[PDB]
Amino acid sequence: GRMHAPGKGLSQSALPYRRSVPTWLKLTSDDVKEQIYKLAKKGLTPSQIGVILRDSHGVAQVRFVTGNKILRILKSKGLAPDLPEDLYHLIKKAVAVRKHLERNRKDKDAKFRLILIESRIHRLARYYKTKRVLPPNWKYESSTASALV
Amino acid sequence: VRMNVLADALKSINNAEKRGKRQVLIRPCSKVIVRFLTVMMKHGYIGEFEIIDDHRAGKIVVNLTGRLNKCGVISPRFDVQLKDLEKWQNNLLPSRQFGFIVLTTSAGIMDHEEARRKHTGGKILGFFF
Amino acid sequence: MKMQRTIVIRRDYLHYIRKYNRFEKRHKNMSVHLSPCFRDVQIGDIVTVGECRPLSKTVRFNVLKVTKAAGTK
Amino acid sequence: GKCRGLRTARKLRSHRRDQKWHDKQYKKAHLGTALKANPFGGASHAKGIVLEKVGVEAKQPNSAIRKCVRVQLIKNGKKITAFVPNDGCLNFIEENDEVLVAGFGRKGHAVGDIPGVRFKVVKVANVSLLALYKGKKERPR
Amino acid sequence: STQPRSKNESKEDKRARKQAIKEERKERRVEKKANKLAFKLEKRRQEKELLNLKKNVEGLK
RNA sequence: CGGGGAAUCAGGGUUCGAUUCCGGAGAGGGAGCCUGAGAAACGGCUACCACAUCCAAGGAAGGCAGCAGGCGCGCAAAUUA
RNA sequence: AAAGUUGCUGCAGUUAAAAAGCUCGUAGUUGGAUCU
RNA sequence: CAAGACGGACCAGAGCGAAAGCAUUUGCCAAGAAUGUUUUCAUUAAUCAAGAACGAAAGUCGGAGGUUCGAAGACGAUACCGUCGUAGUUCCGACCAUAAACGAUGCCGACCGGCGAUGCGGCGGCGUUAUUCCCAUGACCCGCCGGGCAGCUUCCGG
RNA sequence: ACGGUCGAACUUGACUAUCUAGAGGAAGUAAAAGUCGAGGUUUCCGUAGGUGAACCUGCGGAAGGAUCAUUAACGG
């Protein structure tokens, strides 16, 4: 049951039962850590880092290998963004929809989807302000949105 | 969304027993569900059950016996004294000879007779006959 | 904390309605005297107050102890 | 469905209040606009001064002419129509007699044959109709 | 004004005809509303006074 | 007027409590006092408002939501022992 | 009281009275598994 | 030749959208469901008072255009019908917020019979086709999984 | 006796609300037989117009309205 859509699908990932690191992978935890560091210094989100490590380096689950997940690894070395990934992508999508709405006035579909996107933004921002990730004065505005991107 | 996993477990057990099945699979598992099933089990209602351990919330496979008429949950968990227990008994049980109101009390999850034995009231969870 | 040497706290309780065997949230606002010895006290923390003689028209309790919020360092 | 949570007492009580206000017996008893319209004013009996005698035609399946009294109540000046049973009893009522009147029986609803009347005459000249019909008493004039 | 519009119609003459049509509709709607209100008044008066007629002054003697 | 409580009552409830017990209020309506330990007292006083009594026409006197009793009001309630 | 015709226990809402034209949305209500 | 209109047949037990609704080609813009996932976060969720956005048709204000149709209306016959025809039907910008706005049938979650059709995505496989195509790919064939639209059958129960 | 304070009340305006006497206005019934000269049957919903209603018509919507026959391929 999607939160803003009437559809409901089962597409997700099924992690295996074995949490052990397989014996064919010769990489150590530290080597994966500098791989994460160099993949983060070029400007990648933790999800992109995990996808790249899974597809080419054989790192099936980095938190099973290193013991920490990617965001905590990046926050330990200070290579973490001041705003999290999903809120950033929702804000970027809202900026794109607002730009399209400014150039195209009679798109009421775009207005509806913009209201849905910014409702997502406010829910996620409220959650992050609860957990002390964002400052308690953080506020998403229409006109000062692209300055955050 | 899925609220009250014990309600789902009891509803699935009741629906499978109505259909005359010999085994039922209930997911997810929890401590309260296993305690409730043990309370039924020591009274001879659901035989014996397996707990399947994934790294998620578990699953349970229960071997039905045909002895169950109805197992039921009470939501919300009302607060039951030791003087309101008779009123609950007449409301929920079919007779004074069989059936089980289940409480959770500070001495554990147990039934109404042993709650009256231990001189403790608690919260209502279910009934089975 | 908008008054001179006086704060307003809120007590939340759960009143029992007995026909339905249910509860309802209720609150009571309470004006209490905050002594200046309690520095760095802020909105959202738990004050323990004791009853005294009437200090004003609406103030009858007096702040005795302050415990910080659930996350405030 | 209906809310079942442990903290839902306010909604249950408010909803039962506002849905009690839809039962027309409850609203008739509690709105107070049905006692300000009641000629008896919430009383069981009322005395009145006879204005005239009227003949009320019965309804369509029963063809007859029932006979009633148009009477003005003393205590509030409201005029009503009361039912005196028969010509046996109607001749005991003259104009400008003080009659004690009751309801007819259906708590403010009309007679099963004659419409617009909710009241029946119980006493005339401070003596009952039953003791005059049965000859036990006579009425002073 | 039941004048068919012409294919060689010019400005300031089409606009006058259209303005006349809209104004005609405006006072026609206004007097329709007035007639409806007067009929509502008459209906309520008839209902109340027929209820009075069934209340008292009905009988033989 | 509030409460103890009353009617009904499978369980849950619904309705009532002017009324002999406890607490509050008032002594025709307001207001101000004196005395006293205690009253803003009314079977105490002083005004105004509304009533009402006696009179030689100048003046004087009053307060039954105490017990009886009366009038009025009413569907509705006792003996001046 | 009958009245499970006020329904917490305990009612109903296709065709009999009855579900908002649709979605978002604070308050309120409810909230997965896990620690001897 | 021009003017505005409207996109037949294909067009369906079909698809998309929150609903109202959506059908000529190509290009641009930004959304989107499902699928696949050994990605990331780690409870961030469900429902709606207040509040907000859209909302067929008709209708109202202003600009443009008026092809066809056409309320009212003028004629002719007998409320029906014919000829002519105004507003409107059309586009742009603001109001209106109503429909038999229908599944006359809240939303989220769990369980509870069968069958094979179909739309999309993924997977596995003999094989045929691009004149025995010289490996892959599109078009078919068989089977499976997931979310769908929608049927038939059943003494599940109601 | 001045002043202060509590303060019943009185007068004048406005807002109201009630009780009362009301010219006049617009009315129903009983009595006046005095006067003049229809129709719809498929059913609806939302709007707008027609003489107010009804009914008819314009545009959009619904069935809550009675599915026979041909049709897998068969041309490559």
Swiss-Prot record, chain A:
**Cross-link Glycyl lysine isopeptide (Lys-Gly) (interchain with G-Cter in SUMO2), residue numbers?**
42
Q: Which residues carry this modification: Phosphotyrosine?
A: 37
Query: A GO BP term, please?
Result: cytoplasmic translation
InterPro entries, alphabetically?
Ribosomal_uS15, Ribosomal_uS15_arc_euk, Ribosomal_uS15_N, uS15_NS1_RNA-bd_sf
PTM-bearing positions, type N6-succinyllysine: 26, 33
Keyword Transferase found? no
Subcellular location(s) of the protein: Cytoplasm; Nucleus, Nucleolus
Residues recorded as bearing N6-acetyllysine in the entry: 26
Keywords, A to Z, come to:
Acetylation, Cytoplasm, Isopeptide bond, Nucleus, Phosphoprotein, Ribonucleoprotein, Ribosomal protein, Ubl conjugation
Pfam families given in the database record? Ribosomal_S13_N (PF08069), Ribosomal_S15 (PF00312)
Coarse class of the protein's main subcellular location? cytoplasm
Q: How does it assemble?
A: Component of the small ribosomal subunit. Part of the small subunit (SSU) processome, composed of more than 70 proteins and the RNA chaperone small nucleolar RNA (snoRNA) U3.
For this entry, the protein name equals: Small ribosomal subunit protein uS15
Species of the source: Homo sapiens (Human)
State the organism's lineage.
Eukaryota, Metazoa, Chordata, Craniata, Vertebrata
From Swiss-Prot, chain B:
| GO cellular component terms given for this protein | cytoplasm; cytosol; cytosolic ribosome; cytosolic small ribosomal subunit; extracellular exosome; membrane; nucleolus; nucleoplasm
> Which cellular compartments is it found in?
Cytoplasm; Nucleus, Nucleolus
Question: Sorted alphabetically, which keywords does the UniProt record give?
Answer: Cytoplasm, Diamond-Blackfan anemia, Nucleus, Ribonucleoprotein, Ribosomal protein
Pfam families, alphabetized:
Ribosomal_S8 (PF00410)
InterPro entries named in the record: Ribosomal_uS8, Ribosomal_uS8_CS, Ribosomal_uS8_sf
Record's keyword annotation contains Ribosomal protein: yes
Q: Name one GO biological process term.
A: ribosomal small subunit biogenesis
The principal localisation class reads cytoplasm
Q: Name one GO molecular function term.
A: RNA binding
Residues that bear N6-succinyllysine: 87
Source organism superkingdom: Eukaryota
Which HAMAP family does the record match to this protein?
Answer: Ribosomal_uS8_A
* Chain's role: Component of the small ribosomal subunit. Part of the small subunit (SSU) processome, first precursor of the small eukaryotic ribosomal subunit. During the assembly of the SSU processome in the nucleolus, many ribosome biogenesis factors, an RNA chaperone and ribosomal proteins associate with the nascent pre-rRNA and work in concert to generate RNA folding, modifications, rearrangements and cleavage as well as targeted degradation of pre-ribosomal RNA by the RNA exosome. Required for proper erythropoiesis.
Give the multimer and partner information.
Component of the 40S ribosomal subunit. Part of the small subunit (SSU) processome, composed of more than 70 proteins and the RNA chaperone small nucleolar RNA (snoRNA) U3.
Family under the similarity heading: Belongs to the universal ribosomal protein uS8 family.
- Name of the protein this chain belongs to: Small ribosomal subunit protein uS8
Tell me the gene name. Answer: RPS15A
Swiss-Prot record, chain D:
Q: Name one Pfam family in it.
A: Ribosom_S12_S23
Keywords tagged on the record:
Acetylation, Cytoplasm, Deafness, Disease variant, Dwarfism, Endoplasmic reticulum, Hydroxylation, Isopeptide bond, Nucleus, Ribonucleoprotein, Ribosomal protein, Ubl conjugation
Q: Which residues carry this modification: N6-acetyllysine?
A: 134
Which protein family is it in?
Belongs to the universal ribosomal protein uS12 family.
Give the start-end ranges of region Disordered: 1-25
**Chief location:** cytoplasm
Entry annotated with the keyword Nucleus: yes
- UniProt xrefs under Gene3D superfamilies: Nucleic acid-binding proteins (2.40.50.140)
Cell compartment(s), UniProt: Cytoplasm, Cytosol; Cytoplasm; Rough endoplasmic reticulum; Nucleus, Nucleolus
Q: Which disease is it linked to?
A: Brachycephaly, trichomegaly, and developmental delay: An autosomal dominant developmental disorder characterized by brachycephaly, ciliary trichomegaly, dysmorphic features of the face and hands, hearing loss, and developmental delay with short stature. Intellectual disability and autism spectrum disorder may be present in some patients.
Cellular compartments per GO CC: cytoplasm; cytosol; cytosolic ribosome; cytosolic small ribosomal subunit; endoplasmic reticulum; membrane; nucleolus; nucleoplasm
Record the organism. Homo sapiens (Human)
- Per its record, what are the GO molecular function terms? RNA binding; structural constituent of ribosome
Alphabetical list of InterPro entries matching this protein = NA-bd_OB-fold (IPR012340), Ribosomal_uS12 (IPR006032), Ribosomal_uS12_euk/arc (IPR005680)
Official protein name in the record: Small ribosomal subunit protein uS12
Q: Which residues carry this modification: N6-succinyllysine?
A: 53
Organism placement in taxonomy: Eukaryota, Metazoa, Chordata, Craniata, Vertebrata
According to its UniProt entry, the protein's GO biological process terms are: cytoplasmic translation; maintenance of translational fidelity; ribosomal small subunit biogenesis; stress granule assembly; translation
Q: Which residues form the signal peptide?
A: none
From Swiss-Prot, chain E:
Q: Name the disease.
A: Inflammatory poikiloderma with hair abnormalities and acral keratoses: An autosomal recessive disorder characterized by mottled hyper- and hypopigmentation of the skin, sparse scalp hair and eyelashes, sparse or absent eyebrows, and palmoplantar keratoses.
Biased region (Basic and acidic residues) positions are 6-34
Identify the tissues in which this protein is expressed.
Answer: Expressed in the epidermis.
> What is this protein identified as?
Protein LTV1 homolog
Q: What does this protein do?
A: Essential for ribosome biogenesis.
The record's subcellular locations are: Cytoplasm
Residue ranges of coiled coil? 5-61
Similarity section: Belongs to the LTV1 family.
Q: Where is this region: Disordered?
A: 1-34
Q: Which domain of life is it from?
A: Eukaryota
Gene behind the chain: LTV1
What is the protein's species of origin? Homo sapiens
